[PDB]
Design an enzyme around this catalytic site. Structure first.
Site, PDB file in Angstrom:
ATOM      1  N   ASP A 245     -36.822  -6.420 -10.785  1.00 56.27           N
ATOM      2  CA  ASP A 245     -36.371  -6.560  -9.409  1.00 56.27           C
ATOM      3  C   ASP A 245     -37.049  -7.789  -8.802  1.00 56.27           C
ATOM      4  OD1 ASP A 245     -34.812  -5.925  -7.274  1.00 56.27           O
ATOM      5  OD2 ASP A 245     -35.735  -3.984  -6.852  1.00 56.27           O
TER       6      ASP A 245
ATOM      7  N   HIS B  78     -36.936  -5.851  -1.882  1.00 55.23           N
ATOM      8  CA  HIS B  78     -36.146  -4.906  -2.663  1.00 55.23           C
ATOM      9  C   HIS B  78     -36.919  -4.416  -3.881  1.00 55.23           C
ATOM     10  CE1 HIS B  78     -32.711  -3.369  -5.066  1.00 55.23           C
ATOM     11  NE2 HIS B  78     -32.219  -3.086  -3.874  1.00 55.23           N
TER      12      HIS B  78
ATOM     13  N   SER C 191     -28.088   1.295  -6.071  1.00 50.70           N
ATOM     14  CA  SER C 191     -29.346   0.672  -6.459  1.00 50.70           C
ATOM     15  C   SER C 191     -30.537   1.372  -5.824  1.00 50.70           C
ATOM     16  CB  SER C 191     -29.332  -0.805  -6.076  1.00 50.70           C
ATOM     17  OG  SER C 191     -29.115  -0.965  -4.689  1.00 50.70           O
TER      18      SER C 191
END
Ligand SMILES: *[C@@H]1O[C@H](CO)[C@@H](O[C@@H]2O[C@H](CO)[C@@H](O[C@@H]3O[C@H](CO)[C@@H](O)[C@H](O)[C@@H]3O)[C@H](O)[C@H]2NC(C)=O)[C@H](O)[C@H]1NC(C)=O
Ligand SMILES: CCN(CC)Cc1ccc(C(=O)N(CCc2ccccc2OC)[C@@H]2CCNC2)cc1
Ligand SMILES: CC(=O)N[C@@H]1[C@@H](O)[C@H](O)[C@@H](CO)O[C@H]1O
Ligand SMILES: [Ca+2]
EC number: 3.4.21.112
Lengths: 744, 97
Positions: free
Chosen positions: A29, A60, A225
Site C-alpha cells: 500500500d 491509505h 479495499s
C-alpha cells in the site's frame, strides 16, 4: 463508536491468548509513518516507487495496516503481527508491474505468511504479474485482495482477486446488505467458449469502517479495499491460532473461510460468494481440519434460488446449449495435485438421473494448491417431452505426494462428492428461443477496445464482457419475464442448429467473420432464422482522437476498432444489400410515446426499399469530438425492419446503438423496443407503433455514401480469433473445428 | 536434509545441484540420485546468453562446479519485462548470467 474487530468478535480469540504473534504480514500500500503510535513489531519498511519517501502521504497504507495490527483507539485484529510495509503505490495510487515484480520477489525472500493487496487492476492478461502471484502462492503466501469498487454492475471484477488461489473479498454494509460499490459477477477469462468461476470468495464489512489516521486518531472509509484488510486481519489472527502450523497453506486457509461463511438471504452467489465472513466459526474449522480437497461451489442446484442465479432463471430442455459450471478445486494436501482418473457421474434412476448426461474437463496437474473442474450438463432425448427434476452426484479423487510424516511414501488421496439437481422442461417452440452471440466479442484486457458512449470519459475501455449475465443482465431478466429462452453461442456460426432458435441476437460485435460463417448464416436465414443486430459507433477519425496515453505501460494506445466493427458487419450484411454508416450521433428522441436516448450509435447507410425504416433527428457527436462544434442532423435512419422475400424466410432487424440495453451507464432502457422487435421476428407481426409512426421514411438507397474502412495499420489481428497476425492486410485463419465433449 | 526449490510445478532443484521430477523427490528434501530422472547440473533449456526456459534448470546451471543467491537471481524480475507487461524473451525468461 463502531469497532469492526469487536463486531466480528475478535476479542473472544484475544481472551484465548491468540494475537497474531510471529505472523509475517506484508501490506502492499501507500506506506506507513516512521514512528506511528499505533503499531508494534513493524519489522521493515521498503520503497519500490520512484518517489523517494517511505512515509504515507495519502494515509491509505496507514488505514490498511491499522485495520490489521493496530493496538490503540480503533483496534486491529492482530496487534502482535510482524508487519512488513512495502510501498508500491504513489500518493495518488499509481503503480507499475515492474514495481510489483521486484517487491514480490522480496516477499518470497522474507518468507511472508499473509499478503494484502487492497488495490487491484482489471488486467489479467499481464502474464508477468499473474505468473509471479502463482510463484508467490506456490511459496505458501496467503494472498488477500479486493474484488473492486465498480458495482452494482456485473462483470466488474479485479485481478488478482479473481484468481483461484487468491481470496477475493467483497463489501457489505453494517445492515448486511451488499454495498453498492462492490464488484460482482462471474470471471471472464473463460469467455466466449467457457464459463466463468464464482467470485467473490466471501464478503465482509466495507462501509464506514474506522481505522488509524496518518498521525493519530481514527477515521472512516468505505470500499472493498477496506473490506480486504478486515479479512487479512482475520487470516493473520487465524494463522496464529493453529497449533500445527504446517496445516496452513493457501488452500486450507481458503477452505476454512468458505465453509464457515454465513449466507445473506435474498442475494445470489455471484454477489456474495459463499456469504459473509464468520471469524469464530472459521477458527473451529481449522481446529478440526484434515488435509483434504474441496470444491467451490460445493453443489449444483439450478432450481432453488435466488442463491443459484442465473442457473435458476430458466430450466434446461432437450436440444438446449450445454450448461457449464466451472467449479474450483482447492487442494490442501500439496502445492501439486492430480486427478486420479475420470470423474464419475452417478445418476439416481429413482429420481430421473438418466435424463441427464454430464461431461468433464479438468486440469492436468492441480497447481498451486488449486485447479478447476468444469461440468457440462445436457438433457438426453428421452426427456424431450418430460417435465420434472433430475438428480445424481459426481465423484472426483485428488492425489498428491506423500506427506513428511509418512515413511511409507504413499500418495495422499481425497474423494469429494458434488450433488447435481436440475429442472427439465419440454423443448420450447422456436419462436420463444433466442440465441445470444458471444463469440464475436472482443474486450480488454487483451487489447484496447474503446468505450461505447463517448461522453463517458471516466471509463475509456470496454471490459465488462458483453454477456447476458454481465452488463446485459437487466435485458436478460426482462426477456425471461416475457417468456423468451435465451442461450449463448460461444463458437463460430458453423456450430449451432438454426432450426432450434427463432432469433439470433448480435449486439455490439467486434470480431471479424469467417467466410464460411457468412455463407452458413445466409442459408440459415433463408430457412427461417432471424437476425437482430444492435451496433455501435465506428469512425476512423474519432478513433484517432480517442487515442490516449497508457501510463501503466508507458506507451500510446490506438483503438484497435471502434464501438463495433462496422466493416465486418457490412461484409456479413452485404448478402442482403444492407450496411452501416461511419457517422456519430447522440441525443434524445421519442418513439411511440416513449422517451429514448441515442448514446453514440451509427446510422443505416443502405437498406432494401421494401423495408420499414424509421428516422430521427440527432446531434452530430462526430463534429464535437473532432472540432468541438455543434450541429443537428435531421432524418437519421436508426431502425430498420425487413422480411426475406423467400417463402418461410427469416427477418432482419437493424438498430444502430447498443447502449439502450447495456447496464454500464444506462440513462433510459429500450426494453419495450426489444420486446416489440422480438414479437416481429418471432411471429412476423409488425407493430402499429413502428408502422403508423410519422417518423417513417423511404429506406436509404446508399447513393454516394462512402463505405467505412478498416483503419490503416490497426493491430486488431494481434488479438482477433479469426485473423492471422500478418502485421498488415490480415486474413482469416482456417475455420476451427466445433468444440466437442466427452460425456460420461 | 537438502534445501530445494519449493515452487516447481513439475521439477525441483536441490542444493546439491540436481534436477528431479516431483515423483522422485525424497521426503528428506533431496533428489533421489539412484533414479535416472535425477540429473546433475542440468543446463538443458539454456542458451549461451545465460537464460533458460525453466526455473529449475536455471538454478541447477547456476550451481555448476550459493543456493540462496541462485534461487533469488534465477527469478523473473523487472529486468525481464518490457513496457511493464511483456517479457523480453518469453521462451528464456530465467537468466543466471
Ligand atoms: C474453467 O476455468 C479455468 C480457469 O479459471 C480454465 O482453465 C484454463 O483452460 C485452458 C484450456 O481451456 C488452459 O489452457 C491450456 O493451455 C496450454 C496450451 O498450450 C495447454 O497446457 C493446454 O492444452 C490448455 O489449453 C489453461 O491453462 C487453463 N487455465 C488454468 C489457470 O488452469 C478452464 O478452461 C475453464 N473451463 C471451462 C469449461 O470454461
Ligand atoms: C485506467 C484503468 N486501467 C486501464 C488502463 C489502468 C490499469 C490499472 C491496473 C492494471 C493492472 O491490472 N496491473 C498493473 C499494476 C497496478 C497498477 C495500479 C493499481 C493496481 C495494480 O495492480 C495491483 C496488474 C497487472 C495484472 N493485474 C494487476 C492495468 C491497468
Ligand atoms: C476516415 C473516416 O473514418 N472518415 C469519416 C467520414 O467518412 C465521415 O463522413 C465523418 C463524419 O464526421 O467522420 C469521419
Ligand atoms: Ca462487444
Amino acid at each position: 463508536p463502531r469497532q469492526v474487530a469487536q463486531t466480528l468478535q475478535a476479542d473472544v480469540l484475544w481472551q484465548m491468548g491468540y494475537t497474531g504473534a510471529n505472523v509475517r504480514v506484508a501490506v502492499f500500500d501507500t506506506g506507513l509513518s516512521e514512528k506511528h503510535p499505533h503499531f508494534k513489531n513493524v519489522k521493515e519498511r521498503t520503497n519500490w516507487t520512484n518517489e523517494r519517501t517511505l512515509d504515507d502521504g495519502l494515509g491509505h497504507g496507514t488505514f490498511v495496516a491499522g485495520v490489521i495490527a493496530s493496538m490503540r483507539e480503533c483496534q486491529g485484529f492482530a496487534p502482535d503481527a510482524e508487519l512488513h510495509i512495502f510501498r508500491v503505490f504513489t500518493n495518488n495510487q499509481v503503480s507499475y508491474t515492474s514495481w510489483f515484480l521486484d517487491a514480490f520477489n522480496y516477499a518470497i525472500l522474507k518468507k511472508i505468511d499473509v499478503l494484502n493487496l487492497s488495490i487491484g487492476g482489471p488486467d489479467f492478461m499481464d502474464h508477468p504479474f499473474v505468473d509471479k502471484v502463482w510463484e508467490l502462492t506456490a511459496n505458501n503466501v496467503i494472498m488477500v485482495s479486493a474484488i473492486g469498487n465498480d458495482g452494482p454492475l456485473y462483470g466488474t471484477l479485479n485481478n488478482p482477486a479473481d484468481q483461484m488461489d487468491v481470496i477475493g473479498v467483497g463489501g457489505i454494509d453494517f445492515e448486511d446488505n451488499i454495498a453498492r460499490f462492490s464488484s460482482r459477477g462471474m470471471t471472464t477469462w473463460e469467455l466466449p467458449g467457457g464459463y466463468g468461476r464464482m467470485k467473490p470468495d466471501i464478503v465482509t464489512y466495507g462501509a464506514g469502517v474506522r481505522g488509524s489516521g496518518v498521525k493519530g486518531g481514527c477515521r472512516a472509509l468505505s470500499g472493498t479495499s477496506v473490506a480486504s484488510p478486515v479479512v487479512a486481519g482475520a487470516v493473520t489472527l487465524l494463522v496464529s491460532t493453529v497449533q500445527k502450523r504446517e496445516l496452513v497453506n493457501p488452500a486450507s486457509m481458503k477452505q476454512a473461510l468458505i465453509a464457515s461463511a454465513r449466507r445473506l438471504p435474498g442475494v445470489n452467489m455471484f454477489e456474495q460468494g459463499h456469504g459473509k465472513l464468520d471469524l469464530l466459526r472459521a477458527y473451529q474449522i481449522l481446529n478440526s481440519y484434515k488435509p483434504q480437497a474441496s470444491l467451490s461451489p460445493s453443489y449444483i442446484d439450478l432450481t432453488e434460488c435466488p442463491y443459484m442465479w442465473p442457473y435458476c432463471s430458466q430450466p434446461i430442455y432437450y436440444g438446449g446449449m450445454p450448461t457449464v459450471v466451472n467449479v474450483t478445486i482447492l487442494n490442501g494436501m500439496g502445492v501439486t495435485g492430480r486427478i486420479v482418473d475420470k470423474p464419475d457421474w452417478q445418476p439416481y434412476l429413482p429420481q430421473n438421473g438418466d435424463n441427464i448426461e454430464v461431461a468433464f474437463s479438468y486440469s492436468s496437474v492441480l497447481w498451486p494448491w488449486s485447479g478447476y473442474l468444469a461440468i457440462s450438463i445436457s438433457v438426453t432425448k428421452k426427456a424431450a417431452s418430460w417435465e420434472g427434476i433430475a438428480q445424481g452426484h459426481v465423484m472426483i479423487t485428488v492425489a498428491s505426494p506423500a506427506e513428511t510424516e509418512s515413511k511409507n511414501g504413499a500418495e495422499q488421496t481425497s474423494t469429494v462428492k458434488l450433488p447435481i439437481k436440475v429442472k427439465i422442461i419440454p423443448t420450447p417452440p422456436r419462436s420463444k428461443r433466442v440465441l445470444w452471440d458471444q463469440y464475436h466479442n472482443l474486450r480488454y484486457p487483451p487489447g484496447y477496445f474503446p468505450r461505447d458512449n463517448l461522453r463517458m470519459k471516466n471509463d475509456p475501455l470496454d471490459w465488462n464482457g458483453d454477456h447476458i449475465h454481465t452488463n446485459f443482465r437487466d435485458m436478460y431478466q426482462h426477456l425471461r419475464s416475457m417468456g423468451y429462452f435465451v442461450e449463448v453461442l460461444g463458437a463460430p456460426f458453423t456450430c449451432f442448429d438454426a432450426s432450434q432458435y427463432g432469433t439470433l441476437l448480435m449486439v455490439d460485435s467486434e470480431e471479424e467473420y469467417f467466410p464460411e460463417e457468412i455463407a452458413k448464416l445466409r442459408r440459415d436465414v433463408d430457412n427461417g432464422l432471424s437476425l437482430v443486430i444492435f451496433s455501435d459507433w465506428y469512425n476512423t477519425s474519432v478513433m484517432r482522437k480517442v487515442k490516449f496515453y497508457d501510463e501503466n505501460t508507458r506507451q500510446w494506445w490506438m483503438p484497435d476498432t471502434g464501438g463495433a466493427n462496422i466493416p465486418a458487419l457490412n461484409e456479413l450484411l452485404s448478402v442482403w444489400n444492407m450496411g452501416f454508416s461511419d457517422g456519430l450521433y447522440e441525443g434524445e428522441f421519442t418513439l411511440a410515446n416513449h422517451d429514448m436516448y441515442y448514446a453514440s450509435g451509427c446510422s443505416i447507410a443502405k437498406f432494401p426499399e421494401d423495408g420499414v425504416v424509421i428516422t430521427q433527428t440527432f446531434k452530430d457527436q462526430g463534429l464535437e469530438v473532432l472540432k468541438q462544434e455543434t450541429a443537428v442532423v435531421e432524418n437519421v435512419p436508426i431502425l430498420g425492419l425487413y422480411q426475406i422475400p423467400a417463402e418461410g424466410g427469416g427477418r432482419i432487424v437493424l438498430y444502430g446503438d447498443s447502449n439502450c440495453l447495456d447496464d454500464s451507464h444506462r440513462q433510459k432502457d429500450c426494453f419495450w423496443l426489444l420486446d416489440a422487435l422480438l414479437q416481429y421476428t418471432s411471429y412476423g407481426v409488425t407493430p402499429p407503433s413502428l408502422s403508423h409512426s410519422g417518423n417513417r421514411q423511404r429506406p436509404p438507397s446508399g447513393a454516394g455514401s462512402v463505405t467505412p474502412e478498416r483503419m490503416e495499420g490497426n493491430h486488431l489481428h494481434r488479438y482477433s480469433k479469426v485473423l492471422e497476425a500478418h502485421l498488415g492486410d490480415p486474413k482469416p485463419r482456417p475455420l476451427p473445428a466445433c468444440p466437442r465433449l466427452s460425456w460420461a | 536434509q537438502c534445501r530445494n526449490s519449493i515452487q516447481g510445478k513439475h521439477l525441483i532443484t536441490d542444493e546439491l545441484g540436481y534436477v528431479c521430477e516431483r515423483k522422485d523427490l525424497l521426503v528428506n528434501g533431496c533428489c533421489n540420485v539412484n533414479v535416472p530422472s535425477t540429473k546433475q547440473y542440468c543446463c538443458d533449456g539454456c542458451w549461451p546468453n545465460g537464460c533458460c526456459s525453466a526455473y529449475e534448470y536455471c538454478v541447477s546451471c547456476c550451481l555448476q562446479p550459493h543456493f540462496e543467491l541462485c534461487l533469488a537471481k534465477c527469478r523473473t524480475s523487472s529486468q525481464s519485462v518490457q513496457h511493464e507487461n511483456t517479457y523480453r524473451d518469453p521462451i528464456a525468461k530465467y537468466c543466471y548470467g
